[PDB]
Design a protein around this ligand. Structure first.
Ligand SMILES: [Cu+2]
Ligand SMILES: [Cu+2]
Length: 257
């Protein structure tokens, strides 16, 4: 009923999910000429040393690398956040062409892809309760450009053939998400939403300023995934991004001058 196809893409989502036209929808364009430095912010605290990855799953829309979130193992704190947010999963959005694929844009520039590290606020006890709260989630967004290979992404690339089609999963233990980060943790932040249905307005977005680079071969392997299930007509999993939504009555704040 929803996807990224010719007849069920983002422009249709509002019919089943009216909040698609809401006040706090994501992604947005980040205008670097109007986002204002905020001294009230802190540095991010990203604590992934004890992360326990479990599995990788093709959900028909993207693939999720899932983590054990039953203890404080991989957490995000600081920045704009109060309290402790636990990593549940990460996934990507990417294009069919190197000049599109990201959800956020920067001065209207689209990146080749965007990584979302999804975390939920432990005060709400589980993910499903968290998404019902305005401060339920914190998503760390990281842009990808094509250039040099990202070594810490290669284990993901090499498992993709095992999860080509919707509903496939594979063991994915002992993956270190620190290998997906850029050098700098400078960021922009604003209040927004999930970027897929149900489009809930439960997210504190933290979008890193510095992109990571991935190789053309790495991206090409992402583009071989399938939206479809096994034994169905092949539909390449590409262009699984929602475009920028109106900022409305929001301000984007920068952690950096
Ligand atoms: Cu459907
Ligand atoms: Cu996402």
């Amino acid at each position: 009923h929803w996807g990224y196809g010719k007849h069920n893409g983002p422009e249709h989502w509002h019919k089943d999910f009216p909040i698609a036209k809401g006040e706090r929808q994501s992604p947005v364009d980040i205008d670097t000429h109007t986002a204002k430095y905020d001294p009230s912010l802190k540095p991010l605290s990203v604590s992934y040393d004890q992360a326990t990855s479990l599995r990788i799953l093709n959900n028909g829309h993207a693939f999720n690398v899932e983590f054990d979130d039953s203890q404080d193992k991989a957490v995000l704190k600081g920045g704009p956040l109060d309290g402790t947010y636990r990593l549940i999963q990460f996934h990507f959005h990417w294009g069919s062409l190197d000049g599109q694929g990201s959800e956020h844009t920067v001065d209207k520039k689209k990146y080749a892809a965007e990584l979302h590290l999804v975390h939920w606020n432990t005060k709400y006890g589980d993910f499903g309760k968290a998404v019902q709260q305005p401060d339920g989630l914190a998503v760390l967004g990281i842009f990808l450009k094509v250039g040099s290979a990202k070594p810490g992404l290669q284990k993901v690339v090499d498992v993709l053939d095992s999860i080509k089609t919707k509903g496939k999963s594979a063991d994915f233990t002992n993956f270190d998400p620190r290998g997906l980060l850029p050098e700098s943790l400078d960021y922009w932040t604003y209040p927004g939403s999930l970027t897929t249905p149900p489009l809930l307005e439960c997210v504190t977005w933290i979008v890193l300023k510095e992109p990571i680079s991935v190789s053309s071969e790495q991206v090409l392997k992402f583009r071989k995934l399938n939206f479809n299930g096994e034994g169905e007509p092949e539909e390449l999993m590409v262009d699984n991004w929602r475009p920028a939504q109106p900022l409305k009555n929001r301000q984007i704040k920068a952690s950096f001058k």
